[PDB]
Design a protein around this ligand. Structure first.
Ligand SMILES: [Cl-]
Ligand SMILES: [Cl-]
Ligand SMILES: [Cl-]
Ligand SMILES: [Cl-]
Ligand SMILES: [Cl-]
Ligand SMILES: [Cl-]
Ligand SMILES: [Cl-]
Ligand SMILES: [Cl-]
Ligand SMILES: [Cl-]
Ligand SMILES: [Cl-]
Ligand SMILES: [N+]
Ligand SMILES: [N+]
Ligand SMILES: [N+]
Ligand SMILES: [N+]
Ligand code: NA
Ligand code: NA
Ligand code: NA
Ligand code: NA
Ligand code: NA
Ligand code: NA
Ligand code: NA
Ligand code: NA
Ligand code: NA
Ligand code: NA
Ligand code: NA
Ligand code: NA
Lengths: 108, 108
């Protein structure tokens, strides 16, 4: 029954909003990702060019095999970026190994 | 008010631990799922029969098209089920429509 803290050396962590750098033209563009050895997760700018959207991450595993482009992670809508025509989509999945990827965006 | 509550008619919600009904033999078995018209999510029993695991949900969309078994959602490891040889994996994705699915479990 002990309590410990991380209060950034008694300063607290100071937050300002991370502003979007919305792509100049691309219909879909990776914002950021992290692979920590167990989880592959990230954030993706998605242009609101149609109501129905499907966004997926296609990847090559730990030995750089794409498995006929069959290693797939689905992204989820996170929310619109206010004042822009882009939205944030996020993804996160347990992944044993990953060497490369690209993003696929399907509109109807 | 500016603050509202749901306190179950002043009784509070009473939580009993939901005990696992581990499959009697299956290597992978759906526990539960929910589709609410926007999000398709759920929970899956996965037998710990090898260290390396990949668990995916393959589904047919809103007009019952499988797209050659190409509509894929990746599940993530949630935790072991204490005292059993099964684990919980979960999944959740934004999905426009879905009519059917099955689960695929790859060990290595
Ligand atoms: Cl610190
Ligand atoms: Cl990220
Ligand atoms: Cl639109
Ligand atoms: Cl995850
Ligand atoms: Cl109460
Ligand atoms: Cl009561
Ligand atoms: Cl569920
Ligand atoms: Cl659909
Ligand atoms: Cl069918
Ligand atoms: Cl185990
Ligand atoms: N996914
Ligand atoms: N409260
Ligand atoms: N309530
Ligand atoms: N309450
Ligand atoms: Na501290
Ligand atoms: Na300070
Ligand atoms: Na402070
Ligand atoms: Na990044
Ligand atoms: Na791998
Ligand atoms: Na592809
Ligand atoms: Na079964
Ligand atoms: Na269910
Ligand atoms: Na799989
Ligand atoms: Na448990
Ligand atoms: Na998922
Ligand atoms: Na069927």
């Amino acid at each position: 029954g002990k309590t410990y803290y991380d209060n950034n050396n008694s300063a607290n962590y100071q937050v300002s909003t991370h502003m979007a750098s919305i792509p100049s033209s691309a219909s879909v563009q990776l914002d950021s990702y992290n692979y920590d050895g167990s989880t592959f997760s990230g954030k993706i700018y998605v242009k609101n060019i149609a109501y129905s959207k499907k966004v997926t991450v296609v990847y090559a595993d730990g030995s750089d095999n794409w498995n006929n482009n069959g290693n797939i992670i689905a992204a989820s809508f996170s929310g619109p970026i206010s004042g822009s025509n882009y939205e944030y989509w996020t993804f996160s999945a347990s992944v044993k190994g990953i060497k490369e990827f690209y993003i696929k965006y399907e509109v109807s």
